[PDB]
Structures are given as C-alpha cells and as structure tokens.
Design an enzyme around this catalytic site. Sequence first.
Site, mmCIF file in Angstrom:
data_model
loop_
_atom_site.group_PDB
_atom_site.id
_atom_site.type_symbol
_atom_site.label_atom_id
_atom_site.label_comp_id
_atom_site.label_asym_id
_atom_site.label_seq_id
_atom_site.Cartn_x
_atom_site.Cartn_y
_atom_site.Cartn_z
ATOM 1 N N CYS A 81 1.067 108.574 96.574
ATOM 2 C CA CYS A 81 0.934 107.206 97.053
ATOM 3 C C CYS A 81 0.635 107.029 98.521
ATOM 4 C CB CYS A 81 2.232 106.460 96.849
ATOM 5 S SG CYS A 81 3.305 106.719 98.302
ATOM 6 N N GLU A 119 1.282 106.020 86.870
ATOM 7 C CA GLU A 119 2.205 105.199 87.701
ATOM 8 C C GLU A 119 1.869 105.276 89.216
ATOM 9 O OE1 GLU A 119 4.392 107.116 89.670
ATOM 10 O OE2 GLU A 119 5.797 105.666 90.459
ATOM 11 N N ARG A 163 13.181 98.719 92.873
ATOM 12 C CA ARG A 163 11.948 99.535 92.916
ATOM 13 C C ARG A 163 10.763 98.991 92.114
ATOM 14 N NH1 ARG A 163 12.367 104.863 94.877
ATOM 15 N NH2 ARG A 163 10.751 106.385 94.357
ATOM 16 N N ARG A 165 6.884 99.036 90.988
ATOM 17 C CA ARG A 165 5.776 99.969 90.852
ATOM 18 C C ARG A 165 4.759 99.465 89.821
ATOM 19 N NH1 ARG A 165 7.706 101.523 94.943
ATOM 20 N NH2 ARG A 165 8.614 103.550 95.516
#
Length: 327
Positions: A81, A119, A163, A165
């Site tokens: 990322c 992801e 979190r 995502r």
Amino acid sequence: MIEIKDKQLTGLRFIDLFAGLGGFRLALESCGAECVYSNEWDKYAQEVYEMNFGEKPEGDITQVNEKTIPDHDILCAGFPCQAFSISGKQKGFEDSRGTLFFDIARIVREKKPKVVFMENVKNFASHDNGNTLEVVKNTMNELDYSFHAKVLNALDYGIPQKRERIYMICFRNDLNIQNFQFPKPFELNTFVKDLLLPDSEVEHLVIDRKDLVMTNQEIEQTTPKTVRLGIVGKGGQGERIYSTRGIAITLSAYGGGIFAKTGGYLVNGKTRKLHPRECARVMGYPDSYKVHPSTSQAYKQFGNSVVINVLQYIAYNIGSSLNFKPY
DNA sequence: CCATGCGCTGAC
DNA sequence: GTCAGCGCATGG
Ligand SMILES: Nc1ncnc2c1ncn2[C@@H]1O[C@H](CSCC[C@H](N)C(=O)O)[C@@H](O)[C@H]1O
C-alpha cells in the site's frame, strides 16, 4: 476468528501471494479450501509462516515464470500500500513498489482462475481522482471478469479496531454468477478492555512521561468509537493516548513516536503500548498462532496484515454464490 | 539492524 | 476549525 460450521468451499484450491503472516490462508481454510502455493520475499515473515504452517514460500514475484504456477481456483492478494496510503507521498503507478498489480494481471491471463480476491487501503478508492481505481476495473474487465469493490470498516463486523480497507472480488464470466453480496453489519459487543493481558505481563511496556497533558476525562460507558484522552510532545502520530472503553486505532508497519505502531492506552492508572499478543487479538488471530521471537519484527508484521474475521465473512458468501446451480 | 521525532494529506 | 493515517527520514 470465528468458527465456521458450513464449510462451503470444501474441495476448492487457492494460492497465497504476498503472504506475510498468512491471514488470507487462515480465513480461507476455516471454510474448507486447500492451499497449493505461497509467495513472499521477506526473510522474517518466511520464518513465521513456516513455523505455523510448516512450508516455506517462494520469493520475489517479479522473476517467477507465470507458467510454473499450479492450477488453482481462487487467487488471493493483499498488495503493498505504500504507493497509495494517505500517510505517504502518493506516487502510485510511477512508484517502483506501486506496480506489483501488473504481475497479478500476468498470472491471471495465463492461469484463468474462477475467482480473484484482493485487498488494499482506503485512499486507494480515491487516489488520482479515482483514475487509479478505474485502471484496475477496466483491466479485469478486458481479461473477462466482472468487478465488485467496497470499503468496509472492521468495527462493523465484530472486532474493535477502526480499520477501513477496500475489498475487491472478481468472477470469471462463463460462471454467470449474479447474486454476490457483501456481508451485512452488526453491533459491536467487545471493546479494547476485554482483550488485554494481566498487568504482571505488560509492566515493561509502561511509560511515565513528564510532558503528559490530559485533555479529556475517562468515560463511564463503552462506545464503538476512538475516544482520545491526552498527548505527549506535539501530539503527532505515536504521541496520542486513547481510552480502553472504546476501540483501537489502526496498527501500522512503519510508524513512529514514543508509542510506536500500536498507539498508547490509559490502563489501570498508567499509559503504555500494546503487547504483540494483544496486537494479535485486535486483528482476530487465535491465541495459538505462534508469534515471531523478535518483538520488532512482530509489530511490523501485524501492521501490514489483514483482520481475519472480515475475510471469513466474505469467503462464505463467495462460496454460497458458487454453490447455487439450479435446473 | 533498531528507535523516535516529525510534518503533511484527507475526509469532515 | 477538528482528528486520524498497512508512513518518511535520520540517528547510532
Ligand atoms: N516482490 C515481492 N515478492 C514477494 N513478496 C513481496 C514482494 N513485494 C512485496 N512483498 C511482500 O508484500 C507483502 C504485502 S502486505 C501482506 C500481508 C498479508 N495480507 C497478511 O495476511 O499477512 C509484504 O510482506 C512484502 O514483504
């Protein structure tokens, strides 16, 4: 993690690319699937994977001939990322680390699996005014796959960590699947205070700083939100202190500050950071996963990983739709 | 390798 | 205004 009774994916096969700790593997096996290939290039991560799973992943994905890879039904991938995060410089496709995507595209064109499961972080859905996301949708389409993508927050699926995502599910077009849906949200009933270890095991992590400036009072009742209580220094990343009657902030892999990577929490009168085992819990890992002996390498590892529980909810749905074949 | 002080971006 | 981030950059 959660226990699955209806093993919907029994008999199917998958590969674990950019493995790290094997979060995509614990999640997919709890449903019945078999792993037939893993890849990861970091020395230390290969040590933990082998220790919990008993096999060593190949290395560097960029110099592997896509034709050597075993047949498989589902390809799994949580790519790097850094070249997309809201914490960095935002260089994207121009970054030497932001091109790994086209290596997945190479593998997919040759092997053609039934499902593709990816992801990445939140900023990836908006980066470059959304162009970056559209390059992915249009490529998967050209390769003859449909494309489903959504942002999910972990505090909505049972784990107390804020979190967010993006998750991308893709199905081959000759399968005609028309009923895939993202799991539905529910109420949080576990807070940070219910996952911590006894005070006798975390004493070495206690920190008495003199520039502690309490700016809010401890709360009385549990809330599914991050409640900030104080600061040290100038209050940047790694210097913020939170309440244990709420939820934890996002763990990171390269973070800094006095309470590096985990955040600081006010516990029984004193401020301290989280222990590796506690990090495991806020990510949904069972107490039996064996952590790496180096504290430093373990924090990094949980920082780059995925929350098991959320992956478990999504994998059951992939299975439900693949098993619906009426006459 | 390991620790810790940043200082900017984004989504309200 | 207000707050949070699968991070960057330098020191031994
Ligand atoms: N070229 C490459 N070949 C193999 N592994 C790579 C790679 N480039 C990056 N990686 C690995 O990419 C991973 C991305 S984060 C992976 C975390 C994983 N989803 C989890 O459940 O643990 C990092 O561990 C990095 O070490």
